[PDB]
Design a protein around this ligand. Structure first.
Ligand SMILES: *[C@@H]1O[C@H](CO)[C@@H](O[C@@H]2O[C@H](CO)[C@@H](O[C@H]3O[C@H](CO)[C@@H](O)[C@H](O)[C@@H]3O)[C@H](O)[C@H]2NC(C)=O)[C@H](O)[C@H]1NC(C)=O
Lengths: 52, 51, 28, 235, 102
């Protein structure tokens, strides 16, 4: 997917239910362009937590 | 018996036969966050040419 | 511009290499 | 109307009914509230004939309306204990009441808690004509019948057989439970989230279900599905 | 003798406020209550009147996340495959929520 824009890292609602696996919740809306047909588009996400 | 039947519970792409399903008033707790803040800071002020 | 609306999500939380190999060809 | 049986009235207060194993026979006993009395005899150590002409049809609830009450085939958590499908416990000293219902002339009631269910009774003669913790002595107990004055129930809760599920499914729903309610962290001393200090008492209500773990699965966004099927128990 | 002073700072273009309005972030959500015929004594003819602020079918009294979501009868499946032990159409009621997550 040559077309993709990352998520927004400011909307964060994470509860540390498990120490190994952080639990997070996010909402909002998305604004991405559209391709000329015949491919698969992606959408990447981040977190203030570093690894995942 | 005068029973409506069985309850299938679907929740976020799930399917559940419950033990006991209900809705009732309950004692919960509510949290509060402090609202607002302010600041000041040093600034350099100088002049070089006036037209 | 295909776009989406975001509800209350459920999204939750290494050793690697270079692992590179060959290329195919097309531009423009 | 009545399920199978309009149980008779017994005048002798000392009515000793032992354990019974028949599936169909015990239903009229619940219609006679024999299990309701047995909780009093087991825990309040008081033997009293309950539901004289009362039955299930005259049991009152804090909400004025219950369609499921009209459906007598629905099992209640109190009646699930005669079959032993769940557990009920004594009113702990750490428990504080919800000021919803009016407690006048009351003896026994129920409470759906986030961990389980609990029964509340006190002395014979000592009637709860007030919403307070104690119950003052009253002569209204002289007669053997209180027509659901000693009995009141909380919530319109449904109960049915359950097939077990792995706890990781219970865990993700528990994770899903926190997602839909960022505004709570503590429930009755049982931790629900982790945040700053919180005010202890709040009248608060959300739909919930039981699946067989220490925590309840709550929802404000679910959907129901009712089906009828052949089951030997429902006969 | 006494005096009063008036300071002037800027020249700018703004205008009056006629009335103030607020708009949250509406988000679609919904629940359906699935009811078989003869269970709950479904209205074989759906009544045009609806108690949309109570929902006597489901918890006549409760605070909701909803801006008074409307309800409608719908023609569900009927038969053993539908599990309603009857060929009559099912009896499904519904509710709308208008809510703001954040
Ligand atoms: C109050 O305490 C009573 C004494 O424990 C108790 O009666 C007992 O109930 C159990 C039910 O499990 C009976 O156990 C027998 O019967 C069941 C099914 O009927 C079997 O599965 C068991 O294996 C066992 O054979 C006891 O026999 C019975 N005790 C007496 C003396 O009848 C009441 O149920 C208690 N009531 C409350 C409200 O707590």
């Amino acid at each position: 997917c040559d077309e993709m824009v990352h998520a927004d890292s400011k909307l964060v609602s994470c509860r540390q239910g498990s120490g190994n696996m952080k639990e997070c919740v996010t909402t909002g809306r998305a604004l991405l362009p559209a391709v000329n047909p015949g491919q698969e588009a992606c959408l990447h996400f981040t977190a203030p937590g570093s690894p995942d | 018996v005068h029973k409506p039947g069985e309850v299938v519970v679907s929740y976020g792409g799930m399917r559940v036969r419950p033990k006991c399903y209900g809705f009732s008033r309950m004692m919960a707790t509510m949290e509060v966050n402090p609202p607002e803040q302010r600041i000041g800071q040093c600034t350099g002020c100088h002049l070089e040419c006036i037209n | 511009d295909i776009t989406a609306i975001r509800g209350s999500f459920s999204v939750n939380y290494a050793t690697c290499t270079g692992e590179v190999t060959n290329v195919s060809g097309c531009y423009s | 109307g009545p399920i199978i049986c309009a149980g008779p009235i017994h005048s002798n207060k000392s009515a000793g009914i032992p354990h019974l194993l028949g599936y169909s026979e015990k239903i009229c006993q619940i219609d006679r509230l024999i299990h309701v009395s047995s909780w009093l005899r087991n825990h309040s150590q008081f033997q009293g004939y309950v539901g004289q002409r009362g039955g299930r049809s005259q049991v009152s609830y804090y909400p004025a309306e219950n369609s499921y009450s009209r459906w007598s085939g629905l099992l209640s958590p109190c009646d699930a204990d005669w079959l032993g499908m769940l557990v009920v416990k004594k009113a702990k000293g750490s428990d504080m009441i919800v000021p919803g219902p009016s407690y006048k002339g009351k003896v026994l009631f129920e409470r759906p808690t986030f961990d389980g269910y609990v029964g509340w009774g006190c002395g014979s003669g000592k009637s709860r004509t007030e919403s307070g913790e104690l119950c003052s002595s009253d002569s209204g107990t002289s007669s053997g019948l209180l027509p659901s004055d000693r009995v009141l129930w909380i919530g319109d809760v449904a109960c049915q057989p359950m097939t077990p599920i792995p706890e990781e499914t219970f865990l993700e729903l528990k994770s899903f439970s926190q997602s839909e309610f960022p505004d709570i962290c503590k429930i009755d001393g049982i931790v629900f989230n982790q945040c700053e200090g919180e005010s202890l008492p709040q009248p608060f209500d959300v739909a919930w279900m039981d699946v067989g773990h220490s925590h309840k699965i709550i929802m404000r966004e679910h959907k129901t599905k009712w089906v009828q099927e052949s089951s030997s128990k429902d006969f | 003798s006494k005096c009063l002073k008036i300071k002037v700072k800027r020249i700018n273009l703004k205008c009056k406020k006629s009335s103030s309005y607020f708009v949250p972030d509406a988000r679609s959500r919904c629940t359906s209550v699935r009811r078989c015929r003869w269970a709950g004594d479904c209205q074989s003819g759906c009544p045009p009147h609806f108690t949309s602020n109570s929902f006597s079918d489901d918890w006549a009294g409760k605070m909701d996340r909803a801006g008074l979501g409307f309800s409608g009868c719908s023609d569900g499946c009927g038969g053993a495959a539908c599990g309603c032990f009857n060929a009559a159409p099912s009896c499904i009621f519904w509710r709308k929520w208008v809510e703001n997550p954040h």
